[PDB]
């Protein structure tokens, strides 16, 4: 009956850091996908296992919208079977991923003159994330033989690093807002459908 709140996701004023990526569940609503695929405001719109224009004749039990900010250089990591600092340690899509990855340039919002340091990414992690795993811990990472005990120093590094978005960066270094749509098919009654 009611319309799915995509505007809350795509037109949100503030976005999460990629290490603390934000998930919103979308349920019990009619999804107007024409608002997204008929928009000229995205630079990346990649769907896996489903067609964007052919999405309103499908039903799902749940839709999940994950959103965060990353470098332009790193949008290529938000895809099945990717590696790199983001895919390994921040946001990991599964190989059998079904859904869509949407991204637009947000240099107009997320860069500051002296550099915007509000956005961080995880640099140090002992192992890779499982698909859709989320790590927001801030434990001092022990890179050497001797233990750190919470004290930053040599071989003892804070695991999060700041992006520092300045407006004059090249495109690869400019901030991009990313929205990942996941389409969940359970053997349970559907709650999200298109017109």
């Amino acid at each position: 009956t009611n319309l799915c709140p995509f505007g809350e996701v795509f037109n949100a004023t503030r976005f999460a850091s990629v290490y603390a990526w934000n998930r919103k569940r979308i349920s019990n609503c009619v999804a107007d996908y024409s608002v997204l695929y008929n928009s000229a405001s995205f630079s990346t719109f990649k769907c896996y296992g489903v067609s964007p224009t052919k999405l309103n004749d499908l039903c799902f039990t749940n839709v999940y919208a994950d959103s965060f900010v990353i470098r332009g250089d790193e949008v290529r990591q938000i895809a099945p079977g990717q590696t790199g600092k983001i895919a390994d340690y921040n946001y990991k899509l599964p190989d059998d991923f079904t859904g869509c990855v949407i991204a637009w340039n947000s240099n107009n919002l997320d860069s500051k003159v002296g550099g915007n340091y509000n956005y961080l990414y995880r640099l140090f992690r002992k192992s890779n994330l499982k698909p859709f795993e989320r790590d927001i811990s801030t434990e001092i990472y022990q890179a050497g033989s001797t233990p750190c005990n919470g004290v930053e120093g040599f071989n003892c590094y804070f695991p999060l690093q700041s992006y520092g978005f300045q407006p004059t960066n090249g495109v690869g270094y400019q901030p991009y807002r990313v929205v990942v749509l996941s389409f969940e098919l359970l053997h349970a009654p559907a709650t999200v459908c298109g017109k």
Partner: antibody
Amino acid sequence: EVQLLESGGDLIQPGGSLRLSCAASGVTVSSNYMSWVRQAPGKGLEWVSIIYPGGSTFYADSVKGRFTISRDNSKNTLYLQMHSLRAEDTAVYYCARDLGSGDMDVWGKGTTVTVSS
Amino acid sequence: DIVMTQSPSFLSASVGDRVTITCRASQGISSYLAWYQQKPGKAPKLLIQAASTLQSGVPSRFSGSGSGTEFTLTISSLQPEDFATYYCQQLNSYRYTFGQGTKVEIKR
């Protein structure tokens, strides 16, 4: 107390194979970004390969599909396996710890690889 | 692809002189630059990271500055033992790109 000791360089004929080793102390190979960097006689620095702490590996175009970087956690040692070696692979090979952004603060003394008939 | 041009390729300066080496990036790389010193027959030595942070164990006469596309390595009082080749490196890149290097000779 931190050192990177490397070995394995030798004279090798074109198309042959060779494995370089880099024994670490003070740094935990498996916890760090570890790179191999090579330098031809009289030329600049060329990055070759890297292994992330999580295990992901990456290679420069000129070696992609021929070199394989790996590590042995029990021995705290970095490896560079080379196959189908070419004359342009002749260089001094260094191992280095990458602080995370590409900046390498710890280097080994280097090992020399000569690819000739 | 981002290119790092380093200038000059060679420079000669007298002991005590203030020396400045420039590294230019083909587009804005923020502060993502490192500087290295390689003396002949030695591995390179990390001098500066993040454009301006003096690495621990480098004499304070070495100093870096710069943001965006133009970065400088300054040796404020050239010493005979500062004979070396100096390299810049674009950081936080898929490519791990080095500059061509600047050879610094002592003029005596």
